[PDB]
Amino acid sequence: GSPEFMDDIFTQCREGNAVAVRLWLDNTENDLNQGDDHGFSPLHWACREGRSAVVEMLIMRGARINVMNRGDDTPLHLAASHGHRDIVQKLLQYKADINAVNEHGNVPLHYACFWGQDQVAEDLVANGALVSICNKYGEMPVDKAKAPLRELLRERAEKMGQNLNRIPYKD
Amino acid sequence: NLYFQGSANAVCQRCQARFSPAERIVNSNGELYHEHCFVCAQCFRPFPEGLFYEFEGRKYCEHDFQMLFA
Ligand SMILES: [Zn+2]
Ligand SMILES: [Zn+2]
Numbered sequence: 001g002s003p004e005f006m007d008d009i010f011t012q013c014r015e016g017n018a019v020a021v022r023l024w025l026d027n028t029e030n031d032l033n034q035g036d037d038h039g040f041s042p043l044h045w046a047c048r049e050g051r052s053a054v055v056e057m058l059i060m061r062g063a064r065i066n067v068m069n070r071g072d073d074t075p076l077h078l079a080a081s082h083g084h085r086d087i088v089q090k091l092l093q094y095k096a097d098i099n100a101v102n103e104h105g106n107v108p109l110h111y112a113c114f115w116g117q118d119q120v121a122e123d124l125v126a127n128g129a130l131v132s133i134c135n136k137y138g139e140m141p142v143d144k145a146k147a148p149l150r151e152l153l154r155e156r157a158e159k160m161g162q163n164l165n166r167i168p169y170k171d
Numbered sequence: 172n173l174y175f176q177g178s179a180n181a182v183c184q185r186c187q188a189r190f191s192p193a194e195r196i197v198n199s200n201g202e203l204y205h206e207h208c209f210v211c212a213q214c215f216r217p218f219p220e221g222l223f224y225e226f227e228g229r230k231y232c233e234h235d236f237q238m239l240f241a
Contacts, residue, residue, distance in 0.1 A: 114215065
């Protein structure tokens with residue numbers, strides 16, 4: 001009747017403790033995608049806290065890239081919001097849904113713009129992130145940017161052949 | 172004139188951009204914000220009843236704080 005204390009995966013992913021994460025991964029019956037009390041997966045936390053090595057480890061074992069937390073954020077929302085450029089690029093390369101919408105209709109580009117993560121925002125548009133998609137409250141990603149970033153992103157989207165017309169939220 | 176001069180201008184706590192002379196600057200516990208910057212980090216809306224929760228240096232409305240971090 002003795003308790004056997006364990007390291008929990010979510011803390012290890014937050015802290016980026018790679019050996020502990022690997023030992024957890026070696027238990028093949030662990031659910032790579034299971035979220036914590038707020039629906040944050042191991043991948044959500046690794047991406048949010050900028051733990052590049054752990055992010056890659058999870059991706060390589062086949063963790064679902066577009067998993068959603070309780071607010072419907074994906075790992076890409078969090079990596080973009082917190083300006084972790086390497087992790088954003090990794091996620092895009094492993095086919096993250098670049099226009100994934102959270103409970104507010106926000107895409108990762110909203111947060112990259114809002115937080116002035118200029119190069120992250122550029123990386124997103126370069127890979128097909130729509131600049132004119134309104135969230136549920138009528139705000140486009142570039143509405144959240146400062147004017148110089150807005151213009152830089154609109155120019156990139158134009159060159160890529162995006163339609164820049166405002167897209168009001170439907171459904 | 173032979174005196175050193177300071178030149179600092181007020182900027183937004185959140186975005187570090189300057190203020191136009193026409194706009195209202197939100198003061199929240201000594202910190203200056205653009206109106207559109209004193210909003211929830213998650214939904215970008217003004218705080219209902221002015222109520223916000225601080226988490227890891229960002230401000231959230233009750234809904235979003237409860238959904239994500241409570
Ligand atoms: Zn501001
Ligand atoms: Zn909110």
